[PDB]
Amino acid sequence: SVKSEYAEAAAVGQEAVAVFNTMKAAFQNGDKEAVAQYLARLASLYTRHEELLNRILEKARREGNKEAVTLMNEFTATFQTGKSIFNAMVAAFKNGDDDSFESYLQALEKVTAKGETLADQIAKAL
Numbered sequence: 359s360v361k362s363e364y365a366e367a368a369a370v371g372q373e374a375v376a377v378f379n380t381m382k383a384a385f386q387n388g389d390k391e392a393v394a395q396y397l398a399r400l401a402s403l404y405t406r407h408e409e410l411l412n413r414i415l416e417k418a419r420r421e422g423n424k425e426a427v428t429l430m431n432e433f434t435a436t437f438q439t440g441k442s443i444f445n446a447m448v449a450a451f452k453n454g455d456d457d458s459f460e461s462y463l464q465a466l467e468k469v470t471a472k473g474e475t476l477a478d479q480i481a482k483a484l
């Protein structure tokens with residue numbers, strides 16, 4: 359069902375949170391080779407999460423679940439803010455700019471926190 363598809367999507371989201379927290383630790387420690395691999399893994403996970411969220415949104419639209427669609431539209435908007443900040447972070451890493459990186463890392467933590475509140479509401483709406 360769409361609800362089981364959302365539980366899959368949530369798990370992928372949690373995998374990215376885990377990898378993000380490991381990547382932060384490696385950045386603080388100065389292990390740039392590790393950070394590079396974690397960023398590549400995060401890009402894959404976020405791509406996968408987005409593909410699942412889009413399928414869920416489209417299914418809720420086809421099902422006429424207006425409340426779920428409202429909440430999912432808000433969430434995919436928040437997701438795009440994440441994506442933009444993540445790209446900026448990846449660029450800052452490529453450029454060697456640790457100041458921007460640290461900033462963007464903090465910014466992504468805020469996006470994720472707000473996203474999870476919406477994420478919790480979507481679960482109850484589907």
Ligand SMILES: O=C1CNc2ccc(C(F)(F)F)cc2N1
Nearest residue numbers: 404436437440441444469470473
């Ligand atoms: O592509 C990305 C990159 N990072 C990210 C962090 C938080 C969120 C979230 F807040 F959960 F919506 C989404 C993303 N998507």
